[PDB]
């Protein structure tokens, strides 16, 4: 029993993690074989015609107590890849994936090139994440665990005026309309990952909650004309299959269970809570509660 | 800015788990160094468990019952003994992945981060906190035992929890790494259950002071409270008393904000009888309790918005 916000083990990550300074600035990079990947903005912008002007040894990089040396750099998009001549002997099984809204993974937030928090998040519909960060923390990566492969998805890059942030996929392509410049720019409107929202109640009738269990059922249709007026994500046929194993495990059925999430809608909790929170929660996947009401191991 | 529930990095517990296995029982253990520590219930079945003499159970077992299994890996053991309620199994192997490291013994109310493991192998990691009742509200299953609980100040771990058994509502108690439940619990099938809980009202306290300096005052008042009648009212709420020295522990914060706890105080006496009303704190519609005064010192800018 009990039901957290859990995040991936970072071992893995943490042997990965570096200092990268250019002039006066200081930011992470991940040190993955012979290539440090780092945010671009760590020369500043025509970032070309900035990078020309760089010598290797401009670049200072540190892995723990020892200074790696830059032997050659290029960029790719909105990421800086610095060739250095030591390869990684802590390198793990990985690859980059670029993830879509509503996917959910693990941060290791890092000052310095020294990791002090790990902590799991989703990427919002409006291509946000909802994080915990202070300057300092650019570089910071997310990820996830399959196995023994650890697929890295994001690098943070930016604080936006709401608190939200902005970052890229490992290849440099940013999540969002965002640039990595100084200017005019906003998180777009927000909406509520359903799926999500879905699978957390599944994970509640699991852990022994079914006061929002109602007998009704739904059209997918009029779920969706009822979701939409509440800011919430449309549902899709791929969401339902997706929802089936959980469906099974609890018997209630996906279009079931839309019908008691479209009454907590229309009338609240009314002074309950489902898993310890009086809001509804949206950054648990299907799969992150499958894995957690399983034991999954790494 | 922003605030999450944010656990240690695990890397440096991650290389001390282990699995030991003992007849039919299989959990974790932790290596540190040439020794493996874990709960003393593993030589237990599930019947010596009403009533186990584990004094007796270990006089019958030699070293090589014991199964220990470091990734593919399979340790020899070469002495065992027990120290209250965990078993210490010497190896031949001292662990080269150990970290500097001290076994320290937390209050309620302390936070710590718990790295989830199934069959030595980590799963998980999540942050907590010790309840007033001395229980922690864990996400455990079947083959947890054994799983630790940590703090990574600076470059050194202090283990703080064991993970031992969940109890009939959901919850979770264990021991210190010297074997010493915390709580009125016994590792026995006997009829216990976790007494009363309440809020860890400094906790709180804390976390409003974090809402403060991430930009959020919707909740304050103009109103000051004596301590003694912010305990009457708390009282009231199951809130754990606040005492002299939640106060000054509270003292850097009030300091960075302008804001005296005693006028904290009365900003929570207020949330607490009128509720939320459709508003949030950090993203949350509840008084959260699992941040400590030291936790928001730690996440938090020393520059309030
Ligand atoms: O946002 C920036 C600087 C920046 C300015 C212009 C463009 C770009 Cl890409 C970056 N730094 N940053 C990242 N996370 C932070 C959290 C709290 C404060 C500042 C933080
Ligand atoms: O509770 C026990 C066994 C046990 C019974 C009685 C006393 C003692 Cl010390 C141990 N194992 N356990 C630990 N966390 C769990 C979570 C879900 C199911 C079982 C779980
Ligand atoms: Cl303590």
């Known amino acids: 029993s009990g039901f957290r916000k859990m995040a991936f083990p970072s071992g893995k990550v943490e ?45 200072l990089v540190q892995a723990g107590n020892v200074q790696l040396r830059v032997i050659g750099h290029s960029m790719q998009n909105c990421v800086l890849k610095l060739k250095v001549d030591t390869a990684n ?12 809204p509503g996917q959910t993974f693990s941060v290791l937030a890092c000052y ?16 946000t994440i909802k994080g915990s960060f202070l300057n300092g923390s650019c570089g910071s990566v ?19 005026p709401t608190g939200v942030h902005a970052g890229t996929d490992l290849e440099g392509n940013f999540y969002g309309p965002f640039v990595d ?31 929002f269990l109602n007998r009704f059922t739904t059209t997918l249709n009029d779920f969706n004309l009822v979701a939409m007026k509440y800011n919430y994500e449309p549902l899709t046929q791929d969401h339902v299959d ?40 949206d950054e648990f996947t299907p799969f992150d509660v499958v894995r957690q009401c399983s034991g999954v191991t790494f």
């Open 181 to 211: 410049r100084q200017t005019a720019q906003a998180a777009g409107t927000d909406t509520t990952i359903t799926v999500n929202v879905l699978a957390w109640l599944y994970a509640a009738v699991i852990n022994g909650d079914r006061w």
């Open 15 to 59: 042997g990965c993690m570096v200092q990268v300074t250019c002039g006066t600035t200081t930011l992470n990079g991940l040190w993955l074989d012979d290539v440090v990947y780092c945010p671009r903005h760590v020369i500043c912008p025509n970032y070309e015609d900035l990078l020309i002007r760089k010598s290797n040894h401009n670049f």
């Open 142 to 160: 997310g990820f996830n665990i399959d196995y023994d492969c650890v697929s890295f998805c994001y690098m943070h890059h930016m604080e936006l």
């Open 242 to 281: 997706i929802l089936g194993p959980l469906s099974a495990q609890t018997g209630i059925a996906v279009l079931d269970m839309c019908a008691s999430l479209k009454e907590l809608l229309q009338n609240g909790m009314n002074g309950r809570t489902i898993l310890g929170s009086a809001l509804l929660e």
């Open 112 to 127: 310095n090139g020294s990791p002090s928090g790990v902590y799991q998040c989703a990427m919002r519909p409006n291509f």
């Open 89 to 100: 002997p802590k390198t793990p099984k990985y690859k980059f994936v670029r993830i879509q």
